[PDB]
Symmetry: D3
Subunit: 157 residues, 6 copies
């Protein structure tokens, strides 16, 4: 169980919140796959190329963290990694009941697959990508909210 | 982080929901301490001694699980174990914001101490100790909601 | 299913919100039993005898409505009536998840027993017995929140 | 009141959850109209033709259930059927407060029109069409979640 | 602090709810700016021209209320008015946790800028523009829900 | 409306969250009365006399703030002050619907009496008096959560 975790997300863009979850989750599992989704149905502010490059950039410090692009069924992806744990992050603005539903859905699709929830630090409990996207879209300063090594990446387009 | 995790609660009484969380969380740590709080202020149905004996008997199959009763602050008990990880469960009727708050209060008191959330099985996502107390006070069959190895011990007293 | 429905509660005291639910739900069943629970554990403001008399007096205009006080499990009382339908109300301050849970607990104990939810009138969507108890304990005018035929009986004792 | 109920929905697609609500609601009313909406503002996965055919298919067993297409004001539709009850379904992921608002809105538009809420079975409390649409859109197995007689219908496009 | 408040909104369209908030807020501040946003990302039913004209029309009675169009960062707008208070409105259907997040976001962007929340009257607690838009979009009567002086404005297109 | 505002509560004990709300709300009224309710029914940890003395000592720096203890209905105490505005705080763990309800109950009892909501500082959005009582009952360090000028007075008794 503790061999491999998968942390799925749009990461549109990667926040301090997400980095906190990758730090805590990467410490508990021998390996963490960060799975960067297409979120086509979502019309993401950043392209997959930008989103993968920011999250690769922001995670270079964690030696056991691999970043892949994924356009598929999360349950299936875990199957092909022989992964028994989806990592998910909980914040003040979480649709908690929706998170549980997704946890139960993924386990019905893959009977080996459990979901484990982490918290960001208190400083980051009120960060969501949606906030970060508003501040960006409204030409505000988002530099407090995202890792400094990606702010260049994100501040142009 | 993987050496020790603490699953605290009042366990008044331990439910099949709790047993799911012990089973899954125990898989992720080398040792899992089940920490049963006096919780005098809550006026629990079962004595601290009863609650410890019930969870002891329910966890006897999990060889890396150990059961303690404690009188103090939880954040001080994790520091005594050099525990950096608290395990909690998340249910349909959880007060999600309050779990967050408790996570952040536990951190502010012990700055090495994170909180990790597990889910019970779908069949048990609707159990709460509070609905088990109603059934027991009203002399209903709670047998379906708790581990059988405690059911003899609850039904009388 | 249409022969009998049971509207259970503590009714400490019956409110104008409750009266809306009796009026609407009574229209849908040939007989509606108002089942007033002892609820000893909740420490109700009014005695079980007081609560029964108040709702009896408030429902005297509804000819297919009958009022019972009960000590036991609700799921066992519906089986004694061959009742397959529980009536509950939904309010702005309802604990929605807990109503669901109670619905599912009532089913697991009596597998013929579904739960149906009605709404009070908009004017009363903000009443709870709990806000009526505050007003009565603080000697405010609760006259606007409860049926007048009980208002003489509440204000003193 | 008990003569006719209307159960409105997009039914994109019909789930086991929806079938449960049609079963329980059809047992209480002499007749149930299932009203299949355009949900143009919603950009539905299935066309009205597919959505009406699945719900007609899935409800053939219930003799008192009629399925119509409707592109109009729900309050008006009830008026033209002389209907005094909108049937709605409640699940763990429901926006409860939004459901109440819609109940009060419909009654302000049609002063005869009350809303009654049913639960699916526990096995189905965590099903929503949105889940079913994700699993479908992500080429997963949705066969556990929808009536088997429509799975062919839905599994192509 | 009490010199100037800003009340931002899409006002798509202005409701009795919004008028209540403008009444109460305008009584507390020497001056109230109503800031009418583009909500481009929102695809508003009414154009800025219609939305500004309705809110100017509906607020002519309040002598200290000015209406401006704004396509920018709320934090910056307050800075240029030397404003220390964002006025926001709370209703039964509010995403409360999202409102707090926005309050904290705006203060991180402008360290002088606090958020103050008003209630509409009980008669209006269940009004949201989204309801009003549905009723309008569905050719229903919305005349109870919006100030009568704008109903002409809004009832054509 | 700006002449007097009343910030009611049980303040068992006053927290740094409360102090933020006093500081911000006091800026907006010529006089702010902190009204400490007996709240006998709630069984508060600290005596009404203790709670008054603690908040008196915590507010001594705010020259337009005054502290009263009251036994009655809050809506009757505002009428005695000719107070048209109640001040409340909103927190991550607030029961938002219940605050609304209380707002509407206070209005129905005193029809001049509106409710205005302030937020504490981000650092304090996670404090509740209820989490401070847990810490004090469990002999933890609450020093970080309450004003120091009361910390000598809480820790013993």
């Amino acid at each position: 169980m503790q061999k491999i975790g998968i942390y799925p997300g749009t990461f549109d863009p990667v926040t301090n919140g997400h980095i906190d979850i990758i730090h805590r989750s990467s410490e508990l599992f021998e390996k963490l796959i960060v799975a960067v989704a297409h979120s086509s149905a979502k019309n993401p502010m950043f392209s997959l190329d930008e989103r993968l490059k920011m999250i690769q950039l922001a995670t270079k410090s964690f030696k056991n963290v691999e970043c892949v692009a994924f356009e598929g069924l999360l349950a299936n992806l875990a199957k092909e990694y022989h992964c028994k744990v989806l990592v998910r992050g909980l914040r003040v603005v979480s649709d908690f009941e929706y998170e549980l539903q997704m946890g139960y859905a993924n386990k019905s699709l893959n009977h080996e697959l459990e979901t484990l929830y982490f918290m960001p630090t208190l400083q980051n409990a009120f960060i969501s990508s949606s906030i970060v996207r508003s501040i960006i879209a409204h030409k505000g300063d988002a530099s407090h909210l995202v890792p400094k090594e990606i702010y260049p990446l994100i501040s142009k387009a």
